[PDB]
rna-directed RNA polymerase (Sapporo virus), 490 residues
Amino acid sequence: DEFQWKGLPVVKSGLDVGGMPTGTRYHRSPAWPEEQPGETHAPAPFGSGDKRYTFSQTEMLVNGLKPYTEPTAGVPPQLLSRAVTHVRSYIETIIGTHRSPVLTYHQACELLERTTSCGPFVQGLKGDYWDEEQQQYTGVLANHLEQAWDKANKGIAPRNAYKLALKDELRPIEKNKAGKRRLLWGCDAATTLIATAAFKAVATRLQVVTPMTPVAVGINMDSVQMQVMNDSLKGGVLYCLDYSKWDSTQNPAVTAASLAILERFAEPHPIVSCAIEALSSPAEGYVNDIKFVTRGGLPSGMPFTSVVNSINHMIYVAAAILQAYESHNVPYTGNVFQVETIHTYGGGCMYSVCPATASIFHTVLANLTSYGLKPTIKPTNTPVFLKRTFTQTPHGIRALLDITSITRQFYWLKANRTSDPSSPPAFDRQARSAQLENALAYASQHGPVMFDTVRQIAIKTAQGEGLVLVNTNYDQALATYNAWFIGGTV
């Protein structure tokens, strides 16, 4: 029986999943005891210590879960069909109509992320149960997986259940003041296994062919693939959107259609239906002794979140463009993704529209926001995608990582948990230096001048952390990035 919990419609789970982690893994770097000019990010609030601050973590959870309680308008039932077949047809013409065989049990198991949680039903990390050169899972997780597997082949779908938490990361100071913190949903490992077996081969086929499909997932932004994307933009009117609150505004019907398109490139199988059944159902987030069941939107932690959401984006935008043409009563000749050029990774997203669609992009936007989306409207000559500014360099176009993304890595370091971010960190030294070697290699792509200011920051950091760096000068830092980039080898 439903009941209110902090303003949220909630139900007793029958378990006690526990409270959310207190504290942060982020420490301020020993070499940087005060706030440098331009500094704009800090560790997200972390509870009773999180000490500069003071919000109730549970209220920060509830605040984030709130958008999932009020559902979205979606796409008109009869536009959806037309948009769907545009999306399905275009991806049919580039990856073909072969239906990919379901993965075997061992293949899906080894594809699971071992560093992360087992979900709400099993405790610890997945890699507490991994046995190598038996090449399998062992003990009580393996029991959880084998059962879900056997049941899936019988047609019993796994639960769309998640362990709710909060993402420990560096967020804007403004957002930290307001008690904002991003949601983490740790999917039931079993559900990931089933969904991996069902769609991994389809996602791989999309990845092999990126960015020839508006599903960009898997793209090496530090390779030639990024230039392929950049090349595709020429000749069109460029819009660059990064939609706000994308996860919580995803329509269940659009998601069902997206899962139906993936279904088309997979062998019909008890496992595929079970995946579709699970990933189609409302997401159940477990926290403490309750569970919250979504009324709309999509959990960020869902298996193949990037792929499903990117097909969602395709459906949404195709619908919006068609609708626009329909209202202005102009026939839409060909496929949306040939006439226009689209690239999506979840909630963003670049559009290279044709002069005819660009003419009526106002209506296109109004349609997207009428579906319940929030795009976040002026054309641009600057392609921004996956947090990268596409910029001309003396050695070709490069996807440039925010200068602030680079420097921010030197002032803070990910280490042990703490309620005091200022306390001296205990960290793997050689790994820290690897991160900062990489950081500098990125920096180098910004030119000799702006590299040097990062160079100086890197050397001070070397002193205070007792490190040794090789990319600490321009040419060596250039050489190593280029090695990547004609390399493919990041």
Notes: The radius of gyration is 23 Å. The chain has four domains: 1-20+77-215+252-300, 21-76, 216-251+301-382, 383-490. Residues 1-20+77-215+252-300 form one domain.
